[PDB]
């Protein structure tokens, strides 16, 4: 069930308890919000979710509300870390969920081989990962509408948010993200995770 969009507390980034969670902290991207909403927390540990906003950005520009999400897995032999942002709205529509995937050759050597970024029903792909889109090993992502909002790769510097990973959530939060109706938007790291990795795959 919903609570006010500006009353979802920021889930504090915990210490990484295993190599999966440490990898997701290591590869946390930067985001450059060119226009529209800042990223907000979408869920709290009790499983309450953001009510979002009716469809400028004055109700969704508070930098203190920032949150980023991730979930990790494998596909076709590669290691994928999906990072995902929720915005209270994208005339547009209530709610917005977008994601990028950082592809590693495997979790041991952990070389970035490709990046994917959600745009409408598909993904932009950078294969091999263009070094102008990387600040070290930190991917530089843009959030912008020219058409509703889409992610992209950018040379511009961006901002980072406290990260709470799927693997670190309470069961009540994972349950809420699986079952909640986000309307025109869809959580991309729930039970559709592997299906999304297929769509994001770079070959
Ligand atoms: Mg969207
Ligand atoms: Mg591996």
Numbering used by the authors: 1 to 55, 59 to 93, 99 to 154, 157 to 213
What do the authors of the reporting publication say about this deposited model?
It was shown that NLPs function as cytolytic toxins that induce plasma membrane leakage by binding to plant membrane sphingolipid receptor. NLPs share a conserved necrosis inducing protein (NPP1) domain, typically containing the heptapeptide motif, GHRHDWE, which is crucial for toxicity. The aim of the current study was to provide structural and functional information on similarities and differences between non-toxic HaNLP3 and toxic NLPPya, both members of the oomycete type 1 NLP group.
To determine whether slightly less toxic NLPPyaP41A, D44N, N48E displays any structural divergence from the wild-type protein, we determined its crystal structure. Except from the triple mutation, the overall structure strongly resembles the wild-type NLPPya structure with Cα RMSD value of 0.3 Å and 0.5 Å for chain A and chain B, respectively (calculated by DALI). Interestingly, in the NLPPyaP41A, D44N, N48E we observed another variation of the Mg2+ ion octahedral coordination. Here, the Mg2+ ion is directly coordinated by Asp104 and Glu106 and indirectly by Asp93 and His159 via four water molecules. This further highlights that Mg2+ coordination can adjust to the spatial arrangement of different NLPPya scaffolds. Notably, the NLPPyaP41A, D44N, N48E mutant exhibits a limited flexibility of L1, L2, and Lc3 as compared to the wild-type protein, in line with its reduced necrotic activity. The mutations induce the loss of a persistent H-bond (between side chains of Asp44-Asn48), which in NLPPya firmly links Lc3 to L1, affecting their flexibility. The loss of H-bonds linking Lc3 with L1 induced by these mutations not only reduces the thermal stability of NLPPyaP41A, D44N, N48E, but also affects the protein internal movements. Furthermore, the NLPPyaP41A, D44N, N48E mutant, functionally and structurally characterized in this work, pinpoints another important structural element to regulate stability and functional dynamics of the protein.
